Each structure stands twice: as structure tokens, then as C-alpha cells.
RNA sequence: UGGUUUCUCUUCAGAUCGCAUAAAUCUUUCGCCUUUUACUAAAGAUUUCCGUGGAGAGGAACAACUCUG
């Protein structure tokens, strides 16, 4: 009884800071809130065909949905009022969990895209830096107790 | 911020939330991407130092 | 491409190294092969200017 | 290049210098924010991405200026490129009725436009160094390369005219080549586009023949520079032009369970998948692709929505490509709302570019600058 | 230097004091409205209650087990 995978599932359309843009801009997220009413009274229909917002002078390549205005509200919503910003680009915190506790502690999981070559250098023969570092003695314990 | 905590004795590190001191703008703390570079001058010692 | 065109220096630094152990659980023998893949790709991308 | 352009106007029209003072202060904060006042009076603002324009609108409405400034939906900056070569020579007319410079229009190669845009060739370099790159990369004639004209606007736009179709000692009355009159004409005429008031790109103007006056102080000395700009605008209209929409480079990271959702999202916005391959180390595969910037609005927001929040994309600038159709083509009735993916998009893009001055409605008036003779 | 607990009483709480969250009141808004209370939820600030945090005071249990230094 838990549904914790990452901090990015409920990030774009279910985060608690994202619903403040759903209430202040009076535009509901498709599934998130329960259609809370507007804060102010003036909703729309301020001008039919203004010289700035004319329908003919707009290249509508793709429609601006309600999910677009909730993400970046200042670039899309004309005259906002008390819009709380959302948190952007939660990092890839994905973790390869262990399937069974028979594998050891640190193990190369099969659901990992491996390194293909890993043989870019040409060191089949011993390098001349090894003979140069042959006069570098060492007799102490390593950096941690193994 | 890790270089500031190593230089300054201002222990306000990542106990619960992050300690991003370079992002000074309020929009940089809310959005979390940062929209302004900030120059930082501190005294970072070398190995001799 | 922007730093090499401005005739400046370059010094890579593999930060967030805790994710290779505490977030991937990779073996240490394969971690050196992955860290060499970054330094080969960074020096390979540096061979443009 | 800041391809995205979003207009901004205040709600109350009495607060016009308050939004004008805020746009000046916002231009000093962000370096790439070049607030260019349009000829129609609409204060435009050039931006890079969606997060860049939202961060610029955040300080201008809340911190730099305390006035409710309405911002419309953005639009990408187009281009004015000649796809085909010239069909017929031009015939300009000086107001002193003495000079008549003819120039044909031909496009450049793919490697020549990319090298000039990357500032590889230098106008301050020697004539032999310009001839060596033209003989290697372009492989043209040595006579034409030794007498090439100037470049486009501010010596950086790929609009290198060809002032060597005429011989060297043909007239030599005023300049003999593109030095004084045709130099300022190609530098100013390439800025304001004759198609949709955009920037000219990849247009080599081959000056075939020209007529000069023997007494430049008696005849029109500075009058040939607007006369050549009418000849330069007539050359782009008489070479079958095509508007070039910009592209955006998108590199989205996603796991293998959400991979076809990235391909389905780019297909709705007409994006071509360039290279999809699993990145080493992390199990999230990388998918680098191309996307046209005219329909890339909210593509990062749509890639995170459909892929159950497990994806993340970033838009980088990419070189331009010609949009289909032609703005000078007729018999294309564009719909006012919900347009088609039909190849008549260039006629719709030229009519949508008529919000500013210049290329207004009924854009078939290029014969006023290209009158027959 | 020297005490793990527990119960009583004295302040400030500007820390998600509360990783969760009720009611009433006041000033403005909507819907019904037919007299009124019980009503619907948008904004703000005033109490009550469910609770809590450091720091001195008084009793009980091995305070002696010797805790950190």
C-alpha cells in the first residue's frame, strides 16, 4: 500500500503549487481540480476583434490547451493575478531496484544499456609510463581498510 | 554552495531542502532553473593553499 | 563549441558522482569503464577546433 | 538566433510610455532580448525559448514595470529565400533617368551558405584567400571569384552578390563594380524582405550589366542606392521565392517503456526523428530529432504530459529550411481558423506576417517594383 | 563536569511551530430566494478547539549505571 516511484509523476499536472495557477487563472486542469470558480469577476469577452488580438493575424499551427497555460502562465495568460510558479524539470532519479536478493550488493543490472567498445586505447604492450612510474614505490595500506 | 560552506562558517546545508545561494532571484528559487548568472569571489585554498 | 571558439581553456569535472553508486548500484569495475567513456567523449568532442 | 517573437501591449492604452520604459529596462537585463519596435506600432520582443520568454515576461510585468501588459501568442521569425534561379533580367530606373543596373538572382550552394553563416570566410581577408575557398568549396570560375561583391546585411548575412558578370573595364565611371551604390543597396535591401518583411538568406545577386553617369555630382549620386534596393527587391520576386521556417533541435531523454510516445508527439507537430539510440550508463535512451519552430510551441510540455512525466526535452537552435508552397502563388484560399497541413502554408504565412507594415494584404504588388519593359 | 524517566506551572512561538487540518465571527462577492435560521464557495484577517516546540521551579522510580568530554 504505497505508490512512491519518483517525484516527477505528479509534477506537471498534480503538484500542489500547480493548482494555484488552476485557481488564479480560472482554467481547470483536465482531471486535477474540481473546477473552482474565478477569483475576480471579469472572465472574458473584453473585446471581440481588437487590433492586437485579431483572429486573422494569428498563425494557429497548434492550439494552446489548458495544460500549456498552467505550465508557463506569464507567456500565455493575458494579465495574470497572483499566479504561483511551478517547479521545472524534476531530474531523472530513476533507480534500478533489485528483483531478488540472490544477486550481490553491487551488480550490473540487465536493464542497463552497456558500454559497447571500452577498448579505445591501445595498451596490449606495457606502456612507457609504467617504466617511468617504476621508480614510484608503495608499501602502505590503501586509502581505506579493505 | 558547497564551496561557500567550505569557506564560510555558515552551516545551512541540505538538511531538508537545498541551499542554492548562487540563485539570488525569487523566480530562480520557485522555478528552480535559474535565469541569471551570479559572480562569486571566495578564498579556495590549493593543496599547499 | 562556444568555449573553444572563444580561445579559452577547458577543464571537465564529473559532478554528481554519488549517482553512480547510490542511484545505479553499478559495479566498480564497470564504473571505470563508464567514466572512461565520458572522458573519451569529452576529449573527442574537444577535437573540433 | 532569437527565432521566437512575441508581441506585448499594455491593457490600458494610456500607459504607453510605462510599457516602453519597462521594455528598455528588460533589454538591459537579458542580453538576447532585442526589443524591436515594429512599423505597425506593436512593440515586439525577440526570444529564444518558452522558458526564456516566460522569464522575460516575469520581470517585465512584476519587477521592471508595474503595468498589466497583455501578451499575445508568439510567432517564429521567417525568412525570404530565392529557391530557383532568375527567370528574367531586371531594369531599374534612376530618378535622374541616367542609371539602369540589371541584376539576376540565383541561390547559393549548401556548403557556401553554411560557411558564410559560421563566419568562416572574411570580407577583411585578401582577394586570393576568397578565391581559394570559392575554387575549392564552390568550384566556380576564377574570374567571377576574383571580383565578387559585398555580403548581406552588416557583412554577415549570406547574400553575397556577384558583381563580375560584366567585364572589369566595362564602364568604370562611378565605381566599376559594387563599391558605392550597389554596396549599400544589397546591404539595406536584404534587411527588409520584399516577400514578408523578413531577412534575406542564400541569394547571390548576379549583376549582369549596369549603366552609370559620367558626372556623379551633376546626376544622381546617392539616388542609385534606393534604385538598387528596388532592383534587389525585384530580383527576389522574379526568382520564385519561398519562405524558410526555422527548426529547433530537440534532444528528449526517456526510458524504453515510453519511446513511441516521443515518436507520436513529433508526428503531430511534423517532426523528423533524426537518431534514437540507448545512451550508455543510464537506462534512459536518448532521442535527438528536429522540429519546426512554427509548431514547436509547448512541445516540451506535450512531451512530458503524454509520456507519464518520465520525459524531458530541450529546444536548441538549428539552421533553416524552406517551408513548402510559395507566397507569390495565388488560388490558395487560406482558412481563418484551424488551418490545413496542405502545402499552401506559405500563402497563409505571408498573410499572417501582414500584422506589421510592408507586406500587407494583396501582396501581389511586386510588379510595382518589377515593371516590364 | 556527574541523572535515564514521569507528572504538575511560567514565557515566547514567525520553523510545512501541523510532511494533516476543523468550527464560528467580521468586511466584500455569487447562486437560489418566500419570513428567518440551517445554506454554495471565492478573497482577506480575528477567536475557540484537537495538538506541539526551548528554558528556569516542585515530587516518584537503581540515581547511581558512572553518559559525553
UniProtKB/Swiss-Prot annotation, chain A:
Coiled coil segments of this chain: none
Tissue distribution: Widely expressed.
Subcellular location field: Nucleus; Nucleus speckle
Transmembrane segment boundaries: none
Domain of life (superkingdom): Eukaryota
Free-text domain note: The MPN (JAB/Mov34) domain mediates interaction with TSSC4 and SNRNP200. Has structural similarity with deubiquitinating enzymes, but lacks the residues that would bind the catalytic metal ion. Contains a region with structural similarity to reverse transcriptase, presenting the classical thumb, fingers and palm architecture, but lacks enzyme activity, since the essential metal-binding residues are not conserved.
Disease tied to this protein: Retinitis pigmentosa 13: A retinal dystrophy belonging to the group of pigmentary retinopathies. Retinitis pigmentosa is characterized by retinal pigment deposits visible on fundus examination and primary loss of rod photoreceptor cells followed by secondary loss of cone photoreceptors. Patients typically have night vision blindness and loss of midperipheral visual field. As their condition progresses, they lose their far peripheral visual field and eventually central vision as well.
Function field: Plays a role in pre-mRNA splicing as core component of precatalytic, catalytic and postcatalytic spliceosomal complexes, both of the predominant U2-type spliceosome and the minor U12-type spliceosome. Functions as a scaffold that mediates the ordered assembly of spliceosomal proteins and snRNAs. Required for the assembly of the U4/U6-U5 tri-snRNP complex, a building block of the spliceosome. Functions as a scaffold that positions spliceosomal U2, U5 and U6 snRNAs at splice sites on pre-mRNA substrates, so that splicing can occur. Interacts with both the 5' and the 3' splice site.
Subunit structure: Part of the U5 snRNP complex. Component of the U4/U6-U5 tri-snRNP complex composed of the U4, U6 and U5 snRNAs and at least PRPF3, PRPF4, PRPF6, PRPF8, PRPF31, SNRNP200, TXNL4A, SNRNP40, DDX23, CD2BP2, PPIH, SNU13, EFTUD2, SART1 and USP39. Component of the U5.U4atac/U6atac snRNP complexes in U12-dependent spliceosomes. Within the minor spliceosome, which acts on U12-type introns, interacts with PPIL2 and RBM48. Core component of U2-type precatalytic, catalytic and postcatalytic spliceosomal complexes. Found in a mRNA splicing-dependent exon junction complex (EJC) with SRRM1.
Protein name, per record: Pre-mRNA-processing-splicing factor 8
Portion held of the full protein: 245 to 390 of 2335
From Swiss-Prot, chain B:
Top-rank lineage group of the source organism: Eukaryota
Cellular localisation: Nucleus
Function text: Required for pre-mRNA splicing as component of the spliceosome, including pre-catalytic, catalytic and post-catalytic spliceosomal complexes. Component of the U5 snRNP and the U4/U6-U5 tri-snRNP complex, a building block of the spliceosome. As a component of the minor spliceosome, involved in the splicing of U12-type introns in pre-mRNAs.
Subunit annotation: Component of the U5 snRNP and the U4/U6-U5 tri-snRNP complex, a building block of the spliceosome. The U4/U6-U5 tri-snRNP complex is composed of the U4, U6 and U5 snRNAs and at least PRPF3, PRPF4, PRPF6, PRPF8, PRPF31, SNRNP200, TXNL4A, SNRNP40, DDX23, CD2BP2, PPIH, SNU13, EFTUD2, SART1 and USP39. Component of the pre-catalytic, catalytic and post-catalytic spliceosome complexes. Component of the minor spliceosome, which splices U12-type introns. Within this complex, interacts with CRIPT. Interacts with ERBB4 and PRPF8. Interacts with PIH1D1.
Family classification: Belongs to the TRAFAC class translation factor GTPase superfamily. Classic translation factor GTPase family. EF-G/EF-2 subfamily.
Record: disease: Mandibulofacial dysostosis with microcephaly: A rare syndrome characterized by progressive microcephaly, midface and malar hypoplasia, micrognathia, microtia, dysplastic ears, preauricular skin tags, significant developmental delay, and speech delay. Many patients have major sequelae, including choanal atresia that results in respiratory difficulties, conductive hearing loss, and cleft palate.
Protein name from the UniProt record: 116 kDa U5 small nuclear ribonucleoprotein component
Originating species: Homo sapiens (Human)
Residues of the full protein shown: 147 to 195 of 972
Amino acid at each position: 500500500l504505497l505508490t512512491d516511484l519518483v517525484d516527477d509523476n505528479y509534477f506537471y499536472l498534480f503538484d500542489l503549487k500547480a493548482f494555484f495557477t488552476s485557481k488564479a487563472l480560472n482554467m481547470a486542469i483536465p482531471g486535477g481540480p474540481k473546477f473552482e470558480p474565478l477569483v475576480r469577476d471579469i472572465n472574458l469577452q473584453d473585446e471581440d476583434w481588437n487590433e492586437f488580438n485579431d483572429i486573422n493575424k494569428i498563425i494557429i499551427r497548434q492550439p494552446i490547451r489548458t495544460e500549456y497555460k498552467i505550465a508557463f502562465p506569464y507567456l500565455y495568460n493575458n494579465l495574470p493575478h497572483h499566479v504561483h510558479l511551478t517547479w521545472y524539470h524534476t531530474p531523472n532519479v530513476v533507480f534500478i531496484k533489485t528483483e531478488d536478493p540472490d544477486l550481490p550488493a553491487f551488480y550490473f543490472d540487465p536493464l542497463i544499456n552497456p558500454i559497447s567498445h571500452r577498448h579505445s586505447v591501445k595498451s596490449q604492450e606495457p606502456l612507457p609510463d609504467d617504466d617511468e612510474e617504476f621508480e614510484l614505490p608503495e608499501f602502505v595500506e590503501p586509502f581505506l581498510k579493505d | 554552495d558547497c564551496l561557500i560552506e567550505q569557506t564560510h562558517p555558515e552551516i545551512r546545508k541540505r538538511y531538508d531542502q537545498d541551499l542554492c545561494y548562487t540563485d539570488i532571484l525569487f523566480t530562480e528559487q520557485e522555478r528552480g532553473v535559474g535565469i541569471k548568472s551570479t559572480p562569486v569571489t571566495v578564498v579556495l585554498p590549493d593543496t599547499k593553499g | 563549441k562556444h568555449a573553444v571558439q572563444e580561445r579559452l581553456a577547458v577543464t571537465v569535472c564529473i559532478n554528481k558522482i554519488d549517482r553512480l553508486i547510490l542511484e545505479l548500484k553499478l559495479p566498480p569495475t564497470d564504473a571505470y569503464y563508464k567514466l572512461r567513456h565520458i572522458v573519451d567523449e569529452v576529449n573527442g568532442l574537444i577535437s573540433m577546433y | 538566433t532569437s527565432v521566437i517573437k512575441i508581441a506585448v501591449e499594455p491593457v490600458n492604452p494610456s500607459e504607453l510610455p510605462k510599457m516602453l520604459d519597462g521594455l528598455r529596462k528588460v533589454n538591459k537585463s537579458y542580453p538576447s532580448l532585442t526589443t524591436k519596435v515594429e512599423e505597425s506600432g506593436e512593440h515586439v520582443i525577440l526570444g529564444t525559448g518558452e522558458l526564456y520568454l516566460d522569464c522575460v515576461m516575469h520581470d517585465l510585468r512584476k519587477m521592471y514595470s508595474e503595468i498589466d501588459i497583455k501578451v499575445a501568442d508568439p510567432v517564429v521569425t521567417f525568412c525570404e529565400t530565392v529557391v530557383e534561379t532568375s527567370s528574367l533580367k531586371c531594369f531599374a530606373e534612376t530618378p535622374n533617368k541616367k542609371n539602369k543596373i540589371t541584376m539576376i538572382a540565383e541561390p547559393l550552394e549548401k556548403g557556401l551558405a553554411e560557411d558564410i553563416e559560421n563566419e568562416v570566410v572574411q570580407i577583411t581577408w585578401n582577394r586570393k584567400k576568397l578565391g581559394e575557398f570559392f575554387q575549392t568549396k564552390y568550384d566556380w570560375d576564377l574570374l567571377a571569384a576574383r571580383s565578387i561583391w559585398a555580403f548581406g546585411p552588416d557583412a554577415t548575412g549570406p547574400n553575397i552578390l556577384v558583381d563580375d558578370t560584366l567585364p572589369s573595364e566595362v564602364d568604370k565611371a562611378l565605381l566599376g563594380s559594387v563599391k558605392d551604390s550597389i554596396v549599400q543597396g544589397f546591404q539595406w535591401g536584404t534587411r527588409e524582405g520584399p516577400l514578408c518583411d523578413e531577412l534575406i538568406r542564400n541569394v547571390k545577386f548576379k549583376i549582369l550589366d549596369a549603366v552609370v553617369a559620367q558626372e556623379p555630382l551633376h546626376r544622381g549620386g546617392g539616388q542609385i542606392i534606393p534604385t538598387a534596393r528596388r532592383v534587389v527587391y525585384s530580383a527576389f520576386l522574379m526568382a520564385t521565392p519561398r519562405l524558410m521556417e526555422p527548426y529547433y533541435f530537440v534532444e528528449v531523454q526517456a526510458p524504453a517503456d515510453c519511446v513511441s510516445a516521443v515518436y507520436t508527439v513529433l508526428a503531430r507537430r511534423r517532426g523528423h526523428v533524426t537518431q534514437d539510440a540507448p545512451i550508455p550508463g543510464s537506462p534512459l535512451y536518448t532521442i535527438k530529432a528536429f522540429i519546426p519552430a512554427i509548431d514547436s510551441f509547448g512541445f516540451e510540455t506535450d512531451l512530458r504530459t503524454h509520456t507519464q512525466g518520465q520525459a524531458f526535452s530541450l529546444s536548441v537552435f538549428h539552421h533553416w529550411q524552406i517551408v513548402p508552397g510559395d507566397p507569390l502563388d495565388k488560388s490558395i484560399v487560406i482558412r481563418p481558423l484551424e488551418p490545413q497541413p496542405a502545402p499552401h502554408l506559405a500563402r497563409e504565412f505571408m498573410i499572417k506576417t501582414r500584422r506589421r507594415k510592408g507586406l500587407s494584404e494583396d501582396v501581389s504588388i511586386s510588379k510595382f517594383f518589377d515593371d516590364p519593359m
